[PDB]
Amino acid sequence: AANDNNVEWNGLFHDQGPLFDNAPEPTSTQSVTLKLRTFKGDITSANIKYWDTADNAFHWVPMVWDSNDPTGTFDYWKGTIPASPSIKYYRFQINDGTSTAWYNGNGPSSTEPNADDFYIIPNFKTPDWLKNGVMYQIFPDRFYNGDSSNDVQTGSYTYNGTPTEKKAWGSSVYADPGYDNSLVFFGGDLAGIDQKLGYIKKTLGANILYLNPIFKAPTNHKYDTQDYMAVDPAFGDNSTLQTLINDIHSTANGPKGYLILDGVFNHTGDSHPWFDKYNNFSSQGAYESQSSPWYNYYTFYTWPDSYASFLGFNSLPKLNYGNSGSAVRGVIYNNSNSVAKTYLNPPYSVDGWRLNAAQYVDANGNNGSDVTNHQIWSEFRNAVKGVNSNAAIIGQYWGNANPWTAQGNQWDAATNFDGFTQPVSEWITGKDYQNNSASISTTQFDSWLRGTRANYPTNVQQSMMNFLSNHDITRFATRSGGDLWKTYLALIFQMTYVGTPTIYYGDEYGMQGGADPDNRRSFDWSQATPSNSAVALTQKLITIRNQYPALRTGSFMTLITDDTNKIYSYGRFDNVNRIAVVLNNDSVSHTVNVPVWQLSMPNGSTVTDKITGHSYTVQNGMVTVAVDGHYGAVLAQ
Ligand SMILES: OC[C@H]1O[C@H](O[C@H]2[C@H](O)[C@@H](O)[C@@H](O[C@H]3[C@H](O)[C@@H](O)[C@@H](O[C@H]4[C@H](O)[C@@H](O)[C@@H](O[C@H]5[C@H](O)[C@@H](O)[C@@H](O)O[C@@H]5CO)O[C@@H]4CO)O[C@@H]3CO)O[C@@H]2CO)[C@H](O)[C@@H](O)[C@@H]1O
Ligand SMILES: OC[C@H]1O[C@H](O[C@H]2[C@H](O)[C@@H](O)[C@@H](O[C@H]3[C@H](O)[C@@H](O)[C@@H](O[C@H]4[C@H](O)[C@@H](O)[C@@H](O)O[C@@H]4CO)O[C@@H]3CO)O[C@@H]2CO)[C@H](O)[C@@H](O)[C@@H]1O
Numbered sequence: 001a002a003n004d005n006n007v008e009w010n011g012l013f014h015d016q017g018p019l020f021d022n023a024p025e026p027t028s029t030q031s032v033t034l035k036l037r038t039f040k041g042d043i044t045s046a047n048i049k050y051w052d053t054a055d056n057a058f059h060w061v062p063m064v065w066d067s068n069d070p071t072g073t074f075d076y077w078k079g080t081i082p083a084s085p086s087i088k089y090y091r092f093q094i095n096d097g098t099s100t101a102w103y104n105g106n107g108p109s110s111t112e113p114n115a116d117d118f119y120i121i122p123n124f125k126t127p128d129w130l131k132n133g134v135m136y137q138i139f140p141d142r143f144y145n146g147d148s149s150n151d152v153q154t155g156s157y158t159y160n161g162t163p164t165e166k167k168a169w170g171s172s173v174y175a176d177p178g179y180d181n182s183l184v185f186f187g188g189d190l191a192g193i194d195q196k197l198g199y200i201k202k203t204l205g206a207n208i209l210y211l212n213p214i215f216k217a218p219t220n221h222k223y224d225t226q227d228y229m230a231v232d233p234a235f236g237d238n239s240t241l242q243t244l245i246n247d248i249h250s251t252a253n254g255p256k257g258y259l260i261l262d263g264v265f266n267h268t269g270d271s272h273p274w275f276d277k278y279n280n281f282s283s284q285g286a287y288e289s290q291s292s293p294w295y296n297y298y299t300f301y302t303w304p305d306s307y308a309s310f311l312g313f314n315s316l317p318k319l320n321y322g323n324s325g326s327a328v329r330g331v332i333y334n335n336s337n338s339v340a341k342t343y344l345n346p347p348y349s350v351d352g353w354r355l356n357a358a359q360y361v362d363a364n365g366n367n368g369s370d371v372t373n374h375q376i377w378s379e380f381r382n383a384v385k386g387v388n389s390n391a392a393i394i395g396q397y398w399g400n401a402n403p404w405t406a407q408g409n410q411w412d413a414a415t416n417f418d419g420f421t422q423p424v425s426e427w428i429t430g431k432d433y434q435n436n437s438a439s440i441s442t443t444q445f446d447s448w449l450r451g452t453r454a455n456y457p458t459n460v461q462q463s464m465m466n467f468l469s470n471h472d473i474t475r476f477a478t479r480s481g482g483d484l485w486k487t488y489l490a491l492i493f494q495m496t497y498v499g500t501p502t503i504y505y506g507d508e509y510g511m512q513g514g515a516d517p518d519n520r521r522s523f524d525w526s527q528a529t530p531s532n533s534a535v536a537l538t539q540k541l542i543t544i545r546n547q548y549p550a551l552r553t554g555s556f557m558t559l560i561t562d563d564t565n566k567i568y569s570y571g572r573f574d575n576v577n578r579i580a581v582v583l584n585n586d587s588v589s590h591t592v593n594v595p596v597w598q599l600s601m602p603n604g605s606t607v608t609d610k611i612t613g614h615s616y617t618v619q620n621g622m623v624t625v626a627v628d629g630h631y632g633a634v635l636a637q
């Protein structure tokens, strides 16, 4: 490069990784020093332009040359944004004579952008254990029956007239005629999870467990809560939970663990005593009497038959949050004995909440995604963080969750359907998570990923729940057509991307399954051993991620987007490690020349592909590696 009236986009780079930001999660008194990379001698001047919410205006900070990288290929320019309590958004203006370029969250641009700027949210912190961990999601009744003395037998009880149906471990999910799918039980329980912690924390290596609803409810999924204060009998009792939590936090059975519970706070089940639609309690529920002490916990359009609910499901009456200080806000999160605080405080001390149907929470029966909804989650964060600043808050949302994350006053992260699950599905399987024809090329995949990461503050990005499948979508293995290699590729990307790798139980060995409830099959324990190819890769990958902090909190830079050979390469790097991930999304092998010079990997140095164990030497800024079809290489140094 040189001073030739031309800014070379390929040499430019910035993100909030260690090499470019000295304060990614600053307090009110900490200044933020940013570094912008360019090819050596490529420009004449650069400036940081930031919008300050404190005065609703732009501010200008000219940058100064700082240093060259070890390879002498790049320049690092720097500038500092002053410390203050206000949220700020920044972008860079880059000039080389008569040539000007702009750069922000969405990368380089010839014209000045007005969106996707980088974020500076003083005092906003997401749990670092979440940024650095690996999560394992378990649907209780389908993981492992550790105690058969609490199994829901056929005809054990009825819900809305229908009797429960038990099935042999491994048998089909769908309920035989005469029963309901929501009332099928296999026997999975807490005791089982406790007994299988070794498989979770050692065989695989995950250190975070996220469980679907475990509180008293008639169904098998239990999103229709009957009693938030009690573990459902089919899963055990509250003592069983305390023991499970102890064994999860214990370091005697593997690395320290964390437990995230599913918080179903937008609605209760219609069988909850506050509502009591079928009169299962001597008390008078809202549905039973307009004089009920909990009558105003719900919203009736036509008492008692027509009321606000989750997506029209009468079995899920919607909770009325009213105004600040309401009784409902109290039992959910404000009260010391609320659902949220009870489990976060001893003797439970869980580590987080996954917020079910979070966008809908509101007052008076409204549908959320409004001012009131956001005020509620703001108060929710204060309540939760007040009890435990290191308790995670992850909201369920299918699209861009920027509205509940980008102001640092609500959630720490969200279910990453739009930024991970969907794009990964369409690129690798040619299907969307619903299993409908939907394919994207490598260049599109990469663009999609950048655009979605840009929707969030960096600490939020690193905390996103990135799963291949989950209880509401079709199994990746099914969308893949039963092809294990596609799962191999998905796992490699998952374990080396930005955000919390989240493994939906069974996905580690390639468990198949269609749409609800076929996506909740029982777990096959004979297939959960390193003797399984996917399981073995999962354990190896988790070990790899755990070894390199760069994979969890390092920078992310695109290296290759080849639509011809279907090759995708990107680097993850920090002050210590430089890793070039090379993914082959084609059905045939390809020899790729990886431009590791972009990550500043010194010529003559070596890199090890941790997937195959093979070693390579960097020559002329390149690493030549032959990657099998639907496989990948993790070249690290
Ligand atoms: O005259 C009969 C009756 O018919 C109609 O009701 C039927 C529904 O239209 C039909 O869809 C079906 O409902 C099923 C549903 O299809 C099935 O998927 C299941 O849904 C559960 C989930 O399994 C459960 O996980 C939970 O969902 C969570 C979700 O997982 C979570 O991530 C987040 O999204 O929040 C959700 C809610 O907390 O709950 C849902 C709903 O319970 O089970 C459903 C059955 O309850 O079958 C219905 C009955 O046949 C009409 O609508 C009705 O008016 C008629 O009376
Ligand atoms: O201040 C007025 C000056 O304006 C003009 O200077 C320009 C240069 O032409 C640009 O190239 C640039 O200079 C940068 C340079 O691009 C950058 O690499 C870095 O240079 C380092 C170098 O990397 C390092 O290896 C070692 O050699 O030290 C160098 C100097 O620190 O930093 C330079 C900035 O100091 O921008 C300047 C300013 O716009 C003009 O050519 C000058 O005659 C004039 O004085």
Ligand SMILES: OC[C@H]1O[C@H](O[C@H]2[C@H](O)[C@@H](O)[C@@H](O[C@H]3[C@H](O)[C@@H](O)[C@@H](O[C@H]4[C@H](O)[C@@H](O)[C@@H](O)O[C@@H]4CO)O[C@@H]3CO)O[C@@H]2CO)[C@H](O)[C@@H](O)[C@@H]1O
Pocket (backbone or CB within 6 Å): 051, 089, 090, 113, 114, 115, 116, 117, 118, 402, 403, 406, 407, 455
């Ligand atoms: O919440 C949903 C929305 O989420 C996303 O919006 C983000 C932007 O992507 C971020 O860049 C930022 O926006 C800042 C902006 O960076 C800042 O400059 C200022 O906006 C200026 C604007 O630059 C200027 O051209 C002119 O229009 O004045 C504006 C001031 O009003 O302030 C913005 C914040 O208000 O944060 C938002 C919100 O997190 C997504 O891009 C949106 O599509 C989505 O609706």
Ligand SMILES: [Ca+2]
Pocket (backbone or CB within 6 Å): 001, 002, 003, 004, 005, 006, 007, 008, 041, 042, 043, 096
């Ligand atoms: Ca130039």
Ligand SMILES: [Ca+2]
Pocket (backbone or CB within 6 Å): 145, 146, 147, 148, 149, 150, 151, 187, 188, 189, 234
């Ligand atoms: Ca059991």
Ligand SMILES: [Ca+2]
Pocket (backbone or CB within 6 Å): 276, 279, 280, 281, 282, 283, 284, 285, 288
């Ligand atoms: Ca009653």
